[PDB]
Symmetry: C3
Subunit: 249 residues, 3 copies
Amino acid sequence: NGHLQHHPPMPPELAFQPPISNHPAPEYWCSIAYFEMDVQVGETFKVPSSCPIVTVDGYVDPSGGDRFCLGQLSNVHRTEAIERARLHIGKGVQLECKGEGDVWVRCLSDHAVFVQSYYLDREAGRAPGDAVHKIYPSAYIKVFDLRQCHRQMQQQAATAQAAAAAQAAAVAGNIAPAISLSAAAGIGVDDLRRLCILRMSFVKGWGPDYPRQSIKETPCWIEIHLHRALQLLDEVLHTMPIADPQPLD
Amino acid sequence: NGHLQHHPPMPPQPPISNHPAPEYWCSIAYFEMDVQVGETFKVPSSCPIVTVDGYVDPSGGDRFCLGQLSNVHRTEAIERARLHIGKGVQLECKGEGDVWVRCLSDHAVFVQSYYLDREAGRAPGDAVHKIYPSAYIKVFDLRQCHRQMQQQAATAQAAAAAAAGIGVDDLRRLCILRMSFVKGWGPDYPRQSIKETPCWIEIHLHRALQLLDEVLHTMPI
Amino acid sequence: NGHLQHHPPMPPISNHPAPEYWCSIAYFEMDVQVGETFKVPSSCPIVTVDGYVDPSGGDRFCLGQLSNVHRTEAIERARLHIGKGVQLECKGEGDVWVRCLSDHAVFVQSYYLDREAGRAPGDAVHKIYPSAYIKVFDLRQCHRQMQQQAATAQAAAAAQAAAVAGNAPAISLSAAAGIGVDDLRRLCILRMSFVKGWGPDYPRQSIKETPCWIEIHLHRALQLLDEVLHTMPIADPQPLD
């Protein structure tokens, strides 16, 4: 039963709905970090908001800008296995930013790329993180929706702030001493941020059907942080009630 | 011996050198245990105040948000800690290169500082200073650091007559600050080093390092 | 046998635009990278890497200030002797010279110096003596070597194709898009250890076993290699037949 979702290639008025936020656009629309197993290789690559398309391939130009080459990168802990997989990255993939912050992926490599996206999990009726999406060579699909993300943010944020109030009353449960309770400032933070991050492995997938159980076990993957989505999540976090000390009495 | 110093809240000359002001008055590196997480944050001399909180805005400038950073080695203990960083702290740069800390967080912050060691009358590096929420304390005096480095290098340049001869890594420590969030360390705690705490940062003071470099050229080791 | 080589004191290749930086410098202690990668602007042809502490950066990279929680007594000892370190200079389009300013020698790994010394590619350690000023990299020579080496790789790859052909037509055979890329890029990289050397004549058998070394990425060179890789015949799967 499908943990591995296949995404083969399918050949082929934003003036009525305002921007999700009046907030000014970030200087970089995303930042990419390349990994080899559980070790990060190289520096984090920042893509300016002016460059709506960024390519990540196995070539060697270091010039940066709108192309992140992983071919010239060194790693003193690189194994023979990692060398083999680095052989097939080739043309790699393209990451394209549409609208205010939507992201599309185009696989230019001759080999498939495996992706982790909450958006693609929803579209598949799967639960968050309970699926690895395989994008086939030459395929071109949408992997992130800003609106979908924003709606999920507000939902999950509200949920957590309520569960905090729950635990707060579940223990105000004796009586009684002079004890004050307060909600941890930062609930669900590490859970909400995952909604603004994308991850993808080259050539090799992971999961049930595979010998690798997490992306951390794959030879070469990248983690993409979506800055616009992160600004919104920050905005959201700042619209919640301040953790005011509460006497349980 | 009162290794942990308590700093609760208490509501209220020309440049040392002509050396050109730095492009950044400091650099901050976030750590979770003994692993550095994220890239090094550099603060422009233009932004005298910088905020290090546990939120998620990835923008630079004067706000370093630790909430969005990832760590493949992160554990439950660390995630549980990051949970209480909240508003974090503010580092302020006064004068040529003095530094103040303002705990905005709901929880205490533990600072390692030679200036505070000297003020508390403790052996250098033999103390941890607990900064309480809302407290606004001075954690670094440039002028004093400058006298310290000169005199300390001066004694090492003479200790060569012959240990007493200290190296560059010993002196650079005068220009660095370290502080833990939520969890403290020392004899009163299960952790003996800041390197064992779940969340901490290391601050490099550029103006202080420039003066140090200037000193290492006149008083070589 | 001579693994250790002694060096005591004694028209554009492309219309492609110059790089933003001419080189990237990464500092290492043993097998751990310390600090962030230093990038040198094309405007600063000379960069100085020493053991002092100015963090100002720009055209001077000071390793004295950098921290490393995994550092040991042995490494602190070694960082003591870097002192004025070395000085890397870029002449013309992409030639690199080195000037040892340290009181101690520097050990360089340079395919170009291996080529001049008459030793197997990368099978030698070049010891630069205090005050020495030598050319450690030749752009022209590198470019010429990249092309021939890339051409050879393709041939050997297409050779392992006609091989698997000497077994069924129901299957298509294809070559990796990254054949030889790892070997080719090393020609555009320089590595050097301060104070301690490595090799048969030493207790340390590789640079990653040394206390403090740096890896330099030559940008103009890497650009030329990129164009070369892009002029290679696209990978077209051929049926076994």
